[PDB]
Design a protein around this ligand. Sequence first.
Ligand code: OGJ
Ligand code: OGJ
Lengths: 235, 224
Amino acid sequence: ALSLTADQMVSALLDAEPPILYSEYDPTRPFSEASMMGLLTNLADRELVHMINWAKRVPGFVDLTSHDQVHLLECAWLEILMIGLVWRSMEHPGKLLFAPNLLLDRNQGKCVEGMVEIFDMLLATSSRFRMMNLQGEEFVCLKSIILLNSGVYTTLKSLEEKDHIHRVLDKITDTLIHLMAKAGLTLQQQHQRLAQLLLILSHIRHMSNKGMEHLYSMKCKNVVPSYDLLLEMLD
Amino acid sequence: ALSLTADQMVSALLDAEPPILYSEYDPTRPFSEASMMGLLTNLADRELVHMINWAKRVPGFVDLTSHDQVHLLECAWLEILMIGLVWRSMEHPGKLLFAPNLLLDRNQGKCVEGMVEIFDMLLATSSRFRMMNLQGEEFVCLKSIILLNSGVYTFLSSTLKSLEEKDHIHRVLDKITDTLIHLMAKAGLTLQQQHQRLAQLLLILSHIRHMSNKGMEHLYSMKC
Ligand SMILES: CC1=C(c2cccc(O)c2)[C@H](c2ccc(OCCN3CC(CF)C3)cc2)Oc2ccc(O)cc21
Ligand SMILES: CC1=C(c2cccc(O)c2)[C@H](c2ccc(OCCN3CC(CF)C3)cc2)Oc2ccc(O)cc21
């Protein structure tokens, strides 16, 4: 019973949208590698709690095994963080709206070694959605595709589960086209926009893998005392 | 040559298909981590020469600057190796057809530290295309999308020239979308089944981008 009308599916996915969280950003003290990463980490960890709540209201998702729901989130979480980040940043050219009181330009990216690479990509993806005129109904469908699609490629039970996920992606495809039909695009423009949107999910998968490679290099590069750390122990 | 009918575009892309290359595999000298990686490297480097020849016969590609053709290949090469590898492996469940004389099962993957991880993914993607019943006309369209799509979100996006080039690439991806649907229409799928199949195909390009990045992380760890 995730086989509901296209208008029901959009309504369901709009409802499930998590809140737009606030940072505890301190505007008086300037940034540092340690402090900016600390800020963004706290934010991201808060968003992860709200994303699990969301995941449970996405039609089809709850129907799966727990092991499978865990697996799809483990595989999708940074993708969903990033499409979310990019969606909020549409109204603010050249900048990423990490939170309504936390708006970073490309140059503030450089405050973290090799973070600019991922910023430029997120900024580019933002620019793209803007020029596309991505609608919020389209946005929520993409978020759900990313959750269901990104874990699915990794017994009778496991087969019926893959098949259930594929049935739901079909429903969401149907919904996306319904939105495009309703918005008055020709059939050609419908298939072409559906294609342009799904091709972007591939750039978002790439942005994620790069981001993930970056986050790991930051954990690795603290098998070693910091300046901030060694400072206090004398002081 | 954005004037190409759907039947012309498929014919063009089928023509451009490279030959299925041979490995220097010597069945009179046992397997080795060193030797199998040496084999695969030699093969892949030979395929890269054939891929450039192909790339030049993909409609639109030649119209770009050299810098841009280079950039798209720099970003797409391992993706195209892998979709190629996956396509050839469809008819051989559990095994990867690296070449007609080089057919490795999952277990021969273990002969290289952490290579099984990438084998299982390529095998899974093979399983997927099989259950989809991917046609060779669909295959060649995906190959072309991967080349044109995977570099396009970098370029630079800050001069009149690079803008006209991004716009040209986007016009061609639109043409290839049109082609894919035409093939599905011709094969007699309903409109619903057409957009659903188009979606299922493009969602796999996402797994192929993922498989590539993992593969690339693996290739780096082997230079050691
Ligand atoms: C894209 C992006 C970030 C970003 C990401 C990569 C590179 C980069 O430069 C910035 C970092 C970030 C920082 C730390 C992260 O992970 C912390 C670890 N927790 C544990 C849990 C996994 F188990 C995640 C994730 C993202 O700040 C964000 C905050 C909110 C948001 O919507 C997106 C981001
Ligand atoms: C899936 C796959 C590979 C594969 C890929 C990743 C992981 C894995 O386990 C296997 C390796 C491989 C090994 C080395 C490679 O390149 C190294 C050097 N080349 C030349 C150029 C430098 F100038 C790069 C490329 C592919 O063998 C292949 C051969 C042909 C083919 O269609 C695909 C592959």
